[PDB]
Design brief:
The complex is a heterotetramer, with 2 copies of chain A (4 residues) and 2 copies of chain C (124 residues). Chain A has 4 residues and is largely without helices or strands. Chain A has no helices and no strands. In chain C, 34% of the residues are buried. By secondary structure, chain C is α+β, with helices and mostly antiparallel strands. Chain C has a 3-stranded mixed sheet with strand order 3-2-4. Chain C has a single domain (1-124), classed as Potassium Channel Kv1.1, Chain A, CATH 3.30.710. In chain C, helix 2 (42-48) packs across helix 3 and helix 5 runs antiparallel to helix 6. Chain C is built from 6 helices and 5 strands, in the order E-H-E-E-H-H-E-H-E-H-H. Classes of the chains: A little secondary structure (4), C alpha+beta (124). The complex binds ligand A1AB9 (2 copies) and chloride ion (4 copies). One chloride ion (CL) binds next to loops of chain C. Chains C, D: Residues 27-94 form the BTB domain.
Amino acid sequence: WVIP
Amino acid sequence: WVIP
Amino acid sequence: DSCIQFTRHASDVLLNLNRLRSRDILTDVVIVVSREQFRAHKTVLMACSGLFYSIFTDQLKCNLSVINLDPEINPEGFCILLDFMYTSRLNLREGNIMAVMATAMYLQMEHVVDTCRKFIKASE
Amino acid sequence: DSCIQFTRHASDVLLNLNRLRSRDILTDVVIVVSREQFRAHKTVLMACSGLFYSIFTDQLKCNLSVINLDPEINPEGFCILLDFMYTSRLNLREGNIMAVMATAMYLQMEHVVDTCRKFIKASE
Ligand SMILES: N#Cc1c(Cl)ncnc1Nc1ccc2c(c1)CC(=O)N2
Ligand SMILES: N#Cc1c(Cl)ncnc1Nc1ccc2c(c1)CC(=O)N2
Ligand SMILES: [Cl-]
Ligand SMILES: [Cl-]
Ligand SMILES: [Cl-]
Ligand SMILES: [Cl-]
């Protein structure tokens, strides 16, 4: 999971 | 396009 | 093999599937979550959820145009997860995390359940 | 928004769509290319090809279960492109490049046409  |  | 790969292809396919959903193009099922209804593509639901994969591979249920979810399922939680299926983006907030996690467990979406557990553990 | 994103989601969706295709699950169209037939999902075809997007948004053609391609279309070229649609991987070889490029032009798959043009220019 990432900060887009 | 890339070499996978 | 000796194939070449187009990096953005999977993302572009998903963007177009979401555009088709938004325009109600070739949607083949309506998911009923208490008073709310959500139109979708069976193949996208199956590709994202262990529960839908199970339902639409069933010889009788594969032909249904309406699927009614358990009354305990929160419509907003379902909406957030349906958006995630079509975009890879999860709108996870303090006010919805419990509903999202419960819905992801029911839908059998392991990666979502995983990030919800981690976000909850960090707040305790 | 304040969303989080699962990097591998789009790739995982596409892998599952390919698995469904391989098992002939919820495929809703057969593409006929001279003596050969290819089963697929209309939504994936539309999401990858300007030609299929046009065909399946047509009020009459959207309901067809069989689509016959132009007799000049090479089945191997179509097969290579259908595999690309479901995997992001293009099996581009000296022996098939002309057929693949002609098929991609017909199907309106701009990124494929682009790499074929570049590979051809490098060999001249
Ligand atoms: N459609 C399809 C499909 C196929 Cl073909 N093969 C394997 N899994 C498929 N989908 C599916 C099954 C289980 C789970 C998910 C997706 C996400 C998750 O957390 N569990
Ligand atoms: N399905 C869908 C779709 C939608 Cl909804 N919006 C916009 N394009 C869509 N698909 C589509 C249209 C034109 C082309 C491609 C795909 C690849 C390419 O080279 N040209
Ligand atoms: Cl029904
Ligand atoms: Cl997931
Ligand atoms: Cl027909
Ligand atoms: Cl393309």
